[PDB]
């Protein structure tokens, strides 16, 4: 006997192609939502009690898969944290390499978010273009380090493979100037039409006091009135000698949290163009010769370190503690989307129509491998 | 600090401006016809393993840095890498002291459901004469072992190569 | 309708299935789930002419 | 001006009947309708008379 | 430097707050266990609104789940690490929930309760199947009393479709 | 007063003005073969009489 | 016996050109965002695949008969519109008949989508029926604008009145009905701006969310005939084909060119425009195309 | 009779877009404007009936192996899954997981495995091309082993997580409404 008789519970499970892999059970009322709780954790590999059993250097390759769209931001934060507890002397060349791959993976993640938004917003042309122009960035990464995604690159000191040379650094100038001439054809399909602007207007109204104390750390609370950019507040890599300008709006409906990410794509591509004309000087790619050998037996002195870094969706931190041996005692990777599309999504879908459940789901850039950890 | 707009980012919606996304009705479509236009992958793409049988000392230094615990050791004391649990991270390359564990660009490896084609994933990697199976034999970039005939109680695996040597050797004992 | 039945009445397995086991975005669904909608059915139609 | 509203009336005449035949006749049945029978004959004579 | 002034301003408003300032902005300090609830809103109202993950390390030698609490700033950019030390038994695994002051800890406490140990009193989303459905909810797999490779063997009989022994360590 | 006509005429003129940017890029290309195709199309109309 | 073979000729030609028209839609939407995409003879292989299973579903006794009625209605729609000179009947092809017999496919593809019983099929039918509500406000005014500009309703007395004098997208009181039809055609088809009776991605697939093997094959036949019937109804009214076998085949060829013509402008709009919320789809078909067709209706009178 | 349908299958394989977690970063650009699949006719649609090519993209959580086997129970005849990555083969790097399911052939019948982490789309092209070669003659694949050899898979399904999921993952919400 069906014991609700009032509210039908359709729910977007995994096989839906709008939500990626996290089920949101929606207590629908005709065509609105009156209660939207989420069941995440269809992907819980475990990384607390799973990355505690590997040595310190080889715990990179196992830690990449905590966030799929950015295959460099999870390694470049753990590489920043093990940098601190040992206290290396990571040179200028390794700092520049890690800077440029941390920004080119970010423009890859923005392009993937555009393609993921357009696959569920109906319009396929902004999806196919976004994946096509992400593919040349993948084929440019493949010259450098290894595979397309999950390029195990940034070991705790420095990097693993340096630049090929003028065949590569001239090529990045070509694709960045190409995509900066190309980006004016994304506006006319995704941000200038009177469909999308009339589709995402006023849905999911996020207040100003509802973002800073809620768990939101990304660029989407920056569309609400909040002045917080971790690249600007505490620059970590070769950021202070860049002088980029960050966007802040006083709005907070859903399309405010989309135009801010479009402008972040524009200024980040201007960063990669500005970083390239600097060019890296000489130096080694590794950090030190004597305190790296016998690579499993890598006793680190005890203590702890926190690091945190800007992402496509949320400034998400790592937490490593070292007992004093060749094992991370606990490496916690705080997912960006833990209270960023699970808890704030519960008070965002209440009242919204069914057509703007997937669009709201992508207007926060919900990536399901981050809630589980 | 350095807030960029006041209303500079927010643009104006527009009726018939999406017709400028219609420009690619006549340009050349950007795709690769994979049967048969090849891609030529990178000169140092991470792929399969090319252990050298004359420099390997069996010190199991790779055994303790594999993140997925598949470089388990055999006797005649070389390792067999299984690609069942292996992420191609190539931490076993720059940690092997002698240098007897390389990596070459070979990634295409498709096997079917039967177990006799699934013994294909347990190979003691062969010498770098397998680079003469990447070139000089039909440059297809595929795994040049292509069937393995294990035999119980007469343990003599046979890497039946593309047309080369059958590469027989006995395997007795595992671990250390 | 005959020519439409010619293109359907062709056999090849027409096995009947229960209703309680259905899509539900590829998920298990029991008998105590109100899955057929029965509450106002036209909420955008009411909210379109909410002035009228 | 008058042909538009009567044609809209044929559309909205179509619409509500789809609303009727949905949550009364299709979908799952609740577990209080297992104690029900068929149609009785004297209503069925009227149904057959109006149908022919 | 400015973090030393900030922690000096915090220590005026709280006695049990022994603040060590790491590199420039990593202001880490420990408080006693059942005193942070009357303390975290001193940290909220001063300058630190946003709360990151309630990450909790374990220690089997001295039995205590050291729940460190990550706070952050928005006007300066620092990141507090206020930490407690509560006992390790499931009987004594008690901790008052911070939901009246932080709505950030509505969901962080669900993960730290479903993963290992700690039970939070004044919250409603406690026995909800957040993550780790049955039969993984019945034992807490993220402490040090739960060892891998003796539960995985009792859940899956073989770990290698192939040969000899790829299920041990090192 | 939420339904003004100042807004509608600016809408219809901005539509004509963006159609002016539309016909500029479509008909008037750098592709020489596009104008060859235009000549072949109007010759095809002269076939159609 | 000869009208039976001629009707079989028309239904089998409508099959083997409607599937190619849907494949042309797939080819142009492939080239519209830089991809080769499928071959031209693609959805024939879709239909040929979907009749080669070994299990089906058949939720109910009505779950079959609804989509079979949809196929029968969409065949009845194309039987009256004058496909060239070869018509099984040209005495009665009235406007209201063909206009209402496009909507009856949107019954039977949904009336049997309800018998499955699903919140996805329920909310797909919920978001499909507000279209068929909203689209008949500019559709009826387009039919009145065609009506009062000519007077006759037998559709052989319209293509005759076109091939006698004038075209029909000219003469501005009739062109304002064509823009209303050009906007209503994307909804009546299921193309991307007014997509929502298909909705691939936002909801799962709406009405056709779980059909199975044979039922999706009947849907592909019905969808190709809905394409061909509404396109031939637009071309044999607003364009007019009209017109020995070397005359007849060329008549049907130039009719096919005018079939592709409105189908070409149905695709260019229908990829650069995202999907529409059904609450705005009810609000859009009363603001702009209604006043356009109303100005056409008072200028045709 | 038979080859009129046999060639028709290997030209319009409809894939269902499960996007199984880690691995949905080389499932989309496989089917987009670059190295593509619509040239092979591989048109994706999210329906558990209108598909016959399931891509188990990487690992399988047992909170997803319920959903995968429920999706796999609904494709009528020509369902054959293409295992992906290196997770389904023997367990990937998550062999040390209480969750991530090792040895996928013991639960649902895999047709063809690929290798790679992540597998490059050229390897997926080689996998589908070998799947076309396998489906030409027709080679006793999955859907022909899930039918007669059901006694083994149903026992191995019920042994891991089992006891009738249709009451465990259905009654898990009705108190928590
Ligand atoms: S290939 Fe990578 S994962 Fe495999 S054994 Fe070598 S280092 Fe370990
Ligand atoms: S490759 Fe290196 S670690 Fe492995 S057996 Fe040979 S010498 Fe030892
Ligand atoms: S095969 Fe590799 S990339 Fe794929 S899910 Fe497994 S570990 Fe991740």
DSSP state letters, A272-312: HHHHHHH---S--SSS-SGGG-SSS-----SEEEEEEE--S
Q: Answer yes or no: is A3 within a domain.
A: no
Strands E119-120 and E94-95: parallel
CB pair distance less than 8 Å for A215 and E57: no
Residues G119-136 as b or e (16 or more Cβ within 10 Å = b): bbbbbbbbbbbbbbbbbb
Helix/strand/coil for B33:
coil
What are the distances in angstroms from CA A162 to CA A103, B78, G42?
Answer: 17, 30, 47
Per CB-CB distance under 8 Å, the chain B contacts of F37 are: none
Strands E81-83 and E64-71: antiparallel
CB pair distance less than 8 Å for D32 and A1: yes
Taking the C-alpha atoms of residue B25 and residue G28, their distance in angstroms, rounded to an integer, is: 8
Chains that touch E (3 or more CB pairs under 8 A): A, B, H
On whether the CB atoms of residues B126 and B148 are closer than 8 A, the answer is: no
Q: Which of B16, B23, B26 sits opposite F15 (nearest CB)?
A: B16
Taking the C-alpha atoms of residue A75 and residue A61, their distance in angstroms, rounded to an integer, is: 8
CB pair distance less than 8 Å for G272 and B21: yes
Question: Chain centroid to CA A341: how far?
Answer: 14
* End-to-end Cα distance, chain G: 44
Searching chain F, which residue's CA lies closest to the CA of residue B12? Answer: F14
What is the nearest CA distance from G76 to chain D, expressed in angstroms?
19
CB pair distance less than 8 Å for A30 and C39: yes
On whether the CB atoms of residues A146 and B90 are closer than 8 A, the answer is: yes
Q: Which of C19, C31, C41 sits opposite D23 (nearest CB)?
A: C41
On whether the CB atoms of residues A89 and A115 are closer than 8 A, the answer is: no
Here the tokens at position E72 are 């952050």
- Locate tokens 């792929």: which residue? B47
Which residue in A21, H6, A70 sits closest to C27, CA to CA?
Answer: A21
What are the distances in angstroms from CA G129 to CA A295, D22, G126?
Answer: 66, 12, 6
Ligand 3 atom at minimum distance from H21 CA: 5
Here the tokens at position C33 are 């789930």
Q: How was this structure determined?
A: cryo-EM
Q: Is the CB of B79 under 6 A from ligand 2?
A: yes
Here the tokens at position A320 are 């490593």
What is the CB-side half-sphere exposure of residue G260 using CA atoms within 13 A? 13
Pocket test for ligand 1, best of B47, B67, B100 (most atoms within 8 A of CB): B67
Beta strands per DSSP E along chain G: none
Helix/strand/coil for B127:
coil
Which residue in B58, B131, B47, B136 sits closest to B98, CA to CA?
Answer: B58
Whether residue H118 is preceded by a cis peptide bond, meaning omega within 30 degrees of 0, is yes
Which residue in H58, H96, E153, E116 sits closest to A62, CA to CA?
Answer: H96
Taking the C-alpha atoms of residue A18 and residue H17, their distance in angstroms, rounded to an integer, is: 10
In chain B, the largest separation of any two C-alpha atoms, in whole Å, equals 79
Inter-residue long-range contacts of E104-108, CB under 8 Å, 24+ positions, other chains counted: E104/A213, E104/A214, E104/A215, E104/A339, E104/A343, E104/E50, E104/E51, E104/E52, E105/E51, E105/E54, E106/A339, E106/A343, E107/A215, E107/A338, E107/A339, E107/A342, E107/A343, E108/A215, E108/A338, E108/A339, E108/E51, E108/E53, E108/E54
Which residue in G207, G64, G22 sits closest to G132, CA to CA?
Answer: G207
Torsion of CA E153, E155, E157, E162, to 10 degrees: -80
Q: Answer yes or no: is A371 within a domain.
A: no
What are the distances in angstroms from CA A106 to CA A72, A268, A271, G179?
Answer: 8, 8, 11, 44
Binding residues of H: 87, 117
Which residue in E151, A95, F40, A186 sits closest to B20, CA to CA?
Answer: A186
Taking the C-alpha atoms of residue A51 and residue B67, their distance in angstroms, rounded to an integer, is: 9
Taking the C-alpha atoms of residue E163 and residue B122, their distance in angstroms, rounded to an integer, is: 8
On whether the CB atoms of residues E150 and E168 are closer than 8 A, the answer is: no
Here the tokens at position B81 are 């890498």
Q: Dump the DSSP string for H92-155.
A: -SGGG-SSS---GGGTS-EEEEE--SSPPHHHHHHHHHHHHHHHHH--S-TTSHHHHSHHHHHH
Per CB-CB distance under 8 Å, the chain G contacts of C45 are: 130, 133, 282
Helix/strand/coil for E29:
strand
H-helix or E-strand spanning residue G8: helix G2-31
H-helix or E-strand spanning residue H6: helix H3-9
Which residues are paired to H62 by β-bridges? none
Q: Exposed, middle or buried by CB within 10 Å (0-12, 13-18, 19+), for E64?
A: middle
Taking the C-alpha atoms of residue A135 and residue A137, their distance in angstroms, rounded to an integer, is: 5
Backbone angles phi, psi at G194, to 5 degrees: -100, 35
Task: For residue G8, count other CB atoms closer than 10 A to its CB.
Answer: 12
Beta carbons within 8 Å of G109's beta carbon, 6+ residues apart: G66, G67, G70, G207, G208, G219, G222
Q: What is the resolution of this structure in A?
A: 4.0
Range 119-158 of B in CB contact (< 8 A) with H:
121, 141-143
Which residues are paired to G68 by β-bridges? none
Here the tokens at position E75 are 């006007």
- CATH no. for residue A265? 1.10.645.10
Which residue in B9, B76, B89, G123 sits closest to A149, CA to CA?
Answer: B89
What are the distances in angstroms from CA B109 to CA B12, B102, B146, B158, G84?
Answer: 51, 18, 9, 18, 56
On whether the CB atoms of residues G70 and G102 are closer than 8 A, the answer is: no
On whether the CB atoms of residues H21 and H74 are closer than 8 A, the answer is: no
Q: How many CB pairs under 8 A join G and H?
A: 79
Question: Chain centroid to CA G243: how far?
Answer: 23
What are the distances in angstroms from CA H111 to CA A61, B111, H28, H142?
Answer: 29, 9, 22, 6
Range 10-49 of C in CB contact (< 8 A) with A:
24-27, 31-44
Ligand 2 atom at minimum distance from B96 CA: 2
Domain that holds residue A98: 11-364
On whether the CB atoms of residues B50 and B103 are closer than 8 A, the answer is: yes
Q: Exposed, middle or buried by CB within 10 Å (0-12, 13-18, 19+), for H141?
A: buried
Taking the C-alpha atoms of residue G228 and residue A175, their distance in angstroms, rounded to an integer, is: 44
- Locate tokens 């019948």: which residue? H109
On whether the CB atoms of residues A279 and A93 are closer than 8 A, the answer is: no
On whether the CB atoms of residues H39 and B31 are closer than 8 A, the answer is: yes
Range 71-110 of A in CB contact (< 8 A) with E:
84
Ligand located closest to B59 CA: 2
Taking the C-alpha atoms of residue G54 and residue A313, their distance in angstroms, rounded to an integer, is: 46
Q: Exposed, middle or buried by CB within 10 Å (0-12, 13-18, 19+), for G108?
A: buried
On whether the CB atoms of residues C44 and G280 are closer than 8 A, the answer is: no
Q: Exposed, middle or buried by CB within 10 Å (0-12, 13-18, 19+), for E167?
A: middle
Which residue in G266, G223, G191 sits closest to G105, CA to CA?
Answer: G223
CB pair distance less than 8 Å for G272 and A193: yes
Which residue in G250, G262, G205, G197 sits closest to G21, CA to CA?
Answer: G262
What are the distances in angstroms from CA E98 to CA A65, A279, E88, G132, H159?
Answer: 31, 49, 20, 52, 41
Task: For residue A294, count other CB atoms closer than 10 A to its CB.
Answer: 12
Per CB-CB distance under 8 Å, the chain F contacts of B17 are: 18
Taking the C-alpha atoms of residue H95 and residue H118, their distance in angstroms, rounded to an integer, is: 17
On whether the CB atoms of residues A345 and A185 are closer than 8 A, the answer is: no
Searching chain A, which residue's CA lies closest to the CA of residue H102? Answer: A45
- Locate tokens 């039977």: which residue? G108
Question: Chain centroid to CA C38: how far?
Answer: 13
Searching chain B, which residue's CA lies closest to the CA of residue G267? Answer: B22
Per CB-CB distance under 8 Å, the chain B contacts of E76 are: none
Task: For residue B73, count other CB atoms closer than 10 A to its CB.
Answer: 18
Q: What share of chain G is helix, strand, coil (3-state, %, to 5)?
A: 70, 0, 30
**Domains located in chain H, CATH noted:** 1-169 (3.40.50.12280)
Taking the C-alpha atoms of residue G206 and residue G228, their distance in angstroms, rounded to an integer, is: 23
Taking the C-alpha atoms of residue G18 and residue H107, their distance in angstroms, rounded to an integer, is: 43
H helix count then E strand count, chain F: 2, 0
CB pair distance less than 8 Å for B85 and E161: no
Taking the C-alpha atoms of residue E19 and residue E38, their distance in angstroms, rounded to an integer, is: 17
Q: Exposed, middle or buried by CB within 10 Å (0-12, 13-18, 19+), for F3?
A: exposed
Residues A136-146 as b or e (16 or more Cβ within 10 Å = b): bbbbbbbbbbb
Helix/strand/coil for E52:
strand
- Locate tokens 């192939």: which residue? E162
Taking the C-alpha atoms of residue G266 and residue G204, their distance in angstroms, rounded to an integer, is: 24
Per CB-CB distance under 8 Å, the chain E contacts of B122 are: 162-163
Pocket test for ligand 2, best of B52, B53, B98, B125 (most atoms within 8 A of CB): B98
Q: Answer yes or no: is A60 within a domain.
A: yes
Q: Which of H16, H22, H71 sits opposite A65 (nearest CB)?
A: H22
Per CB-CB distance under 8 Å, the chain E contacts of B174 are: 163-165
Taking the C-alpha atoms of residue G145 and residue G147, their distance in angstroms, rounded to an integer, is: 5
Which residues are paired to A333 by β-bridges? A318
Residues E52-61 as b or e (16 or more Cβ within 10 Å = b): bbbbbbbeee
**H-assigned helices in E13-157:** 40-46, 108-115, 152-155
Q: Which of G30, G36, G268 sits opposite B22 (nearest CB)?
A: G268
A62 touches chain E (CB under 8 A): no
Ligand 2 atom at minimum distance from B51 CA: 1
**H-assigned helices in G32-118:** 42-50, 61-78, 95-103, 105-111
Range 64-83 of H in CB contact (< 8 A) with A:
64, 67, 71
Backbone angles phi, psi at A34, to 5 degrees: -110, -15
On whether the CB atoms of residues G116 and D24 are closer than 8 A, the answer is: no
Our count of domains for chain A comes to 1
Helix/strand/coil for A329:
strand
Chains that touch F (3 or more CB pairs under 8 A): B
Helix/strand/coil for A178:
helix
What are the distances in angstroms from CA B106 to CA A218, B133, F4, H53, H116?
Answer: 39, 10, 67, 26, 10
Here the tokens at position A302 are 């005890």
Beta carbons within 8 Å of B63's beta carbon, 6+ residues apart: B71, B72, B73, B79, E170
Range 36-95 of G in CB contact (< 8 A) with C:
51-59, 64, 68-69, 71-72, 75
CB pair distance less than 8 Å for B29 and G36: yes
H-helix or E-strand spanning residue A261: helix A256-278
Backbone angles phi, psi at A308, to 5 degrees: -155, 145
Task: For residue A154, count other CB atoms closer than 10 A to its CB.
Answer: 25
B62 is in an annotated binding site: no
CB pair distance less than 8 Å for A343 and E103: yes
Q: How many CB pairs under 8 A join B and F?
A: 16
Which residue in G101, G102, G109, G112 sits closest to G128, CA to CA?
Answer: G109
Residues in chain C: 52
CA E109-E114-E119 angle, to 5 degrees, is 60
Backbone angles phi, psi at A210, to 5 degrees: -100, 0
Residues G69-96 as b or e (16 or more Cβ within 10 Å = b): bbbbbbbbbbbbbbbbbebbebeebbbe
G286 touches chain D (CB under 8 A): no
What are the distances in angstroms from CA D7 to CA G134, G144, H150?
Answer: 11, 10, 57
The DSSP 8-state label assigned to residue A316 in this structure reads E
* End-to-end Cα distance, chain E: 45
Here the tokens at position G177 are 């009905």
What is the nearest CA distance from H95 to chain E, expressed in angstroms?
7
Q: Is the CB of B65 under 6 A from ligand 2?
A: no
Which residue in A71, A66, A59 sits closest to A300, CA to CA?
Answer: A59
What is the CB-side half-sphere exposure of residue B167 using CA atoms within 13 A? 24
Q: Dump the DSSP string for B51-110.
A: --TTT-----TGGGT-TT----BB---PBPPPTTS-----TTTTT-SS----EES--B-E
CB pair distance less than 8 Å for D28 and C19: yes
> Ligand 3 pocket: which residues have CB below 6 Å?
A 65; B 87; H 22-23, 58-59, 85-87, 92-93, 117-118
Which residue in G171, G137, G84 sits closest to G294, CA to CA?
Answer: G137
What are the distances in angstroms from CA A331 to CA A77, B97, B107, E26, E50?
Answer: 11, 29, 31, 18, 22
**Atom 5 of ligand 3, nearest CA residue:** H58
Tell me, in angstroms, the distance from the centre of ligand 3 to residue A127's CA: 24
Beta strands per DSSP E along chain E: 18-20, 28-30, 51-57, 64-71, 81-83, 86-87, 94-95, 119-120
**Domains located in chain E, CATH noted:** 1-154 (3.30.460.80)
Which residue in A65, A21, A68 sits closest to A42, CA to CA?
Answer: A21
Per CB-CB distance under 8 Å, the chain H contacts of E165 are: none
């Amino acid at each position: 006997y069906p014991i609700d008789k009032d509210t039908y519970e359709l729910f977007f499970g995994p096989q839906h192609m709008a939500t990626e892999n996290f089920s949101i059970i929606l207590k629908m009322d005709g065509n609105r939502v009156v209660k939207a709780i989420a069941n995440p954790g269809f992907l819980h590999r475990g990384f607390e009690k799973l990355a505690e059993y590997r040595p310190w250097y080889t715990n990179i390759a196992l830690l990449l898969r905590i966030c799929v769209p950015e295959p460099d931001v999870p390694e470049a934060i753990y590489s920043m944290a093990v940098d601190e507890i040992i206290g290396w002397e990571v040179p200028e060349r390794a700092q520049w390499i890690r800077t440029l791959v941390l920004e080119m993976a970010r423009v890859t993640a923005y392009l993937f978010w555009i393609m993921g938004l357009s696959f569920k917003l109906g319009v396929y042309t902004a999806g196919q273009w976004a994946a096509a122009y992400r593919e040349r960035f993948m084929a440019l990464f493949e010259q450098l380090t290894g595979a397309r995604v999950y390029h195990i690159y940034t070991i705790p000191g420095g990097v693993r493979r340096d630049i090929p040379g003028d065949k590569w650094l001239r090529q990045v100038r070509d694709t960045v100037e190409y995509l900066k001439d190309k980006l004016k054809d994304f506006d006319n399909v995704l941000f200038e039409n009177y469909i999308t602007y009339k589709r995402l207007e006023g849905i999911g109204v996020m207040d100003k006091k509802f973002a800073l104390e809620e768990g939101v750390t990304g660029p989407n609370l920056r569309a609400t009135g909040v002045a917080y950019d971790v690249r600007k507040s505490d620059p970590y890599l070769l950021y202070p000698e860049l002088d980029f300008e960050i966007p802040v709006l006083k709005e907070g409906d859903a399309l405010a949290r989309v135009l801010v990410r479009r402008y972040e794509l524009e200024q980040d591509l201007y960063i990669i163009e500005q970083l390239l004309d600097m060019g890296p000087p000489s130096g080694p790619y590794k950090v030190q010769d004597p305190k790296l050998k016998n690579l499993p037996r890598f006793k680190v002195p005890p203590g702890e370190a926190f690091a945190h870094v800007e992402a496509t969706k949320g400034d998400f931190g790592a937490y490593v503690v070292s007992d004093g041996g060749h094992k991370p005692y606990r490496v916690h990777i705080r997912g960006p989307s833990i209270a960023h599309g699970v808890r704030v999504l519960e008070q965002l879908l209440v009242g919204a129509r069914l057509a703007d459940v997937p669009a709201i789901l992508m207007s926060l850039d919900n990536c399901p491998p981050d809630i589980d950890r | 600090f350095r807030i960029a707009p006041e209303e500079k980012v927010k643009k104006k919606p527009s009726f018939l401006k999406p017709w400028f996304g219609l420009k690619y009705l006549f340009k050349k479509p950007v795709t690769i016809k994979i049967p048969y236009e090849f891609i030529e992958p990178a000169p140092r793409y991470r792929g399969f393993h090319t252990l050298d049988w004359k420099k390997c000392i069996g010190c199991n230094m790779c055994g303790q840095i594999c993140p997925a615990r598949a470089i388990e050791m055999t006797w005649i004391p070389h390792p067999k890498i299984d690609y069942g649990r292996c992420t191609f991270c190539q931490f076993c390359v720059d940690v092997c002291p002698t240098g007897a564990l390389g990596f070459i660009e070979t990634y295409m490896l498709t096997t079917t459901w039967r177990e006799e084609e699934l013994l294909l994933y347990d190979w003691v990697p062969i010498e770098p004469e397998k680079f003469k199976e990447i070139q000089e034999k039909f440059k297809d970039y595929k795994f040049p072992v292509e069937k393995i005939e294990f035999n119980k109680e007469t343990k003599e695996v046979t890497y039946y190569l593309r047309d080369g040597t059958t590469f027989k050797f006995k395997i007795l004992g595992y671990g250390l | 309708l005959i020519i439409a039945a010619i293109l359907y009445f062709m056999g090849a397995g027409v096995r009947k299935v229960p209703v309680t086991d259905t899509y539900q975005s590829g998920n298990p669904v029991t008998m105590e789930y109100n899955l057929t909608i029965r509450r106002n059915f036209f909420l955008p139609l009411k909210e379109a002419m909410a002035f009228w | 001006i008058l042909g538009a509203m009567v044609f809209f009336g044929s559309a909205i005449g179509f619409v509500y009947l789809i609303r009727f035949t949905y949550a009364v006749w299709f979908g799952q049945r609740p577990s209080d309708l297992e104690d029900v029978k068929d149609a009785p004959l004297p209503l069925a004579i009227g149904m057959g008379i109006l149908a022919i | 430097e400015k973090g030393e002034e900030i922690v000096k301003q915090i220590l005026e408003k709280a006695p049990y707050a022994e603040g060590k300032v790491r590199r420039e902005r990593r202001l880490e300090f420990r408080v006693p266990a059942d005193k942070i609830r009357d303390f975290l809103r001193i940290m909220k109202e001063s300058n630190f609104p946003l709360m990151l993950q309630i990450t909790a390390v374990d220690w089997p030698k001295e039995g205590e789940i050291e729940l460190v609490y990550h706070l952050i700033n928005v006007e300066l950019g620092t990141h507090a690490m206020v930490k407690t030390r509560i006992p390790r038994d499931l009987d004594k695994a008690r901790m008052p929930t911070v939901k009246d002051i932080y709505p950030a800890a509505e969901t962080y406490e669900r993960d730290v309760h479903d993963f290992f140990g700690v039970y939070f009193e004044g919250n409603e989303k406690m026995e909800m199947p957040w993550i780790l459905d049955d039969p993984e909810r019945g034992l807490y797999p993220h402490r040090k009393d739960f060892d891998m490779l003796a539960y995985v063997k009792k859940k899956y009989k073989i770990l290698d479709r192939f040969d000899e022994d790829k299920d041990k360590y090192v | 007063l939420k339904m003004s006509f100042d807004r509608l005429y600016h809408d219809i003129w901005k539509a004509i003005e963006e159609l002016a940017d539309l016909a500029r890029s479509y008909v008037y290309n750098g592709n020489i073969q596009a104008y060859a195709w235009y000549l072949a199309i109007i010759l095809l109309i002269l076939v159609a009489m | 016996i000869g009208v039976f073979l001629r009707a079989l000729l028309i239904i089998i030609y409508a099959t083997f050109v409607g599937f190619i028209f849907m494949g042309i839609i797939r080819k142009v939407t492939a080239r519209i965002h830089r991809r080769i995409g499928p071959p031209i003879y693609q959805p024939i292989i879709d239909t040929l695949k979907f009749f080669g299973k070994k299990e089906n579903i058949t939720h109910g006794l009505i779950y079959d008969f609804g989509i079979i009625y949809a196929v029968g209605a969409t065949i009845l729609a194309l039987m009256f519109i004058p496909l060239g000179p070869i018509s099984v009947l040209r005495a009665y092809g009235d406007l209201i008949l063909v206009t209402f017999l496009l909507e009856i496919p949107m019954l039977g593809i949904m009336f049997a989508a309800m018998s499955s019983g699903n919140p996805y099929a329920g909310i797909g039918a919920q978001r499909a029926l507000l279209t068929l509500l909203a689209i008949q406000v500019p559709l009826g005014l387009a039919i009145i604008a065609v009506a009062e500009y000519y007077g006759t309703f037998s559709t052989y007395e319209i293509v005759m009145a076109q091939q006698k004098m004038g075209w029909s997208i000219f003469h501005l009181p009739l062109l304002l009905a064509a823009i209303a039809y050009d906007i209503v055609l994307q909804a009546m088809f299921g193309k991307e701006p007014f997509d929502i009776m298909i909705a691939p991605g936002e909801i799962s697939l709406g009405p056709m969310v779980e059909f199975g093997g044979k039922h999706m094959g009947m849907l592909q036949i019905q969808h190709a005939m809905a394409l061909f019937a509404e396109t031939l109804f637009f071309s044999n009214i607003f364009l007019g084909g009209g017109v020995p076998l070397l005359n007849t085949l060329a008549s049907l060829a130039v009719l096919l060119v005018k079939q592709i013509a409105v189908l070409l402008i149905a695709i260019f709009v229908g990829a650069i425009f995202p999907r529409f919320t059904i609450d705005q789809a009810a609000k859009f078909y009363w603001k702009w195309p209604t006043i356009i067709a109303a100005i056409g209706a008072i200028m045709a009178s | 009779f038979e080859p009129l349908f046999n060639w028709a299958r290997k030209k319009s394989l409809w894939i269902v877009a499960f996007c199984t977690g880690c691995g949905g970063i080389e499932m989309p650009p496989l089917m987009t404007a670059r190295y593509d699949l619509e040239r092979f006719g591989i048109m994706p649609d999210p329906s558990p009936r209108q598909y016959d090519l399931f891509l188990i993209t990487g690992y399988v959580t047992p909170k997803t192996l319920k959903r995968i086997i429920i999706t796999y129970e609904m494709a009528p005849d020509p369902k054959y899954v293409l295992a992906h990555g290196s997770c389904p083969i023997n367990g990937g790097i998550y062999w040390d997981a209480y969750n991530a399911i090792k040895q996928l052939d013991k639960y649902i019948p895999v047709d063809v495995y690929i290798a790679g982490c992540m597998p490059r789309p050229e390897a997926v092209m080689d996998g589908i091309k070998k799947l076309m070669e396998m489906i030409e003659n027709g080679e006793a694949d999955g859907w022909k082993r899930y039918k007669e050899n059901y006694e083994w898979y149903r026992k191995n399904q019920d042994e891991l997580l089992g006891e009738g999921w249709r009451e465990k993952e259905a009654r898990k919400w009705i108190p928590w409404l």
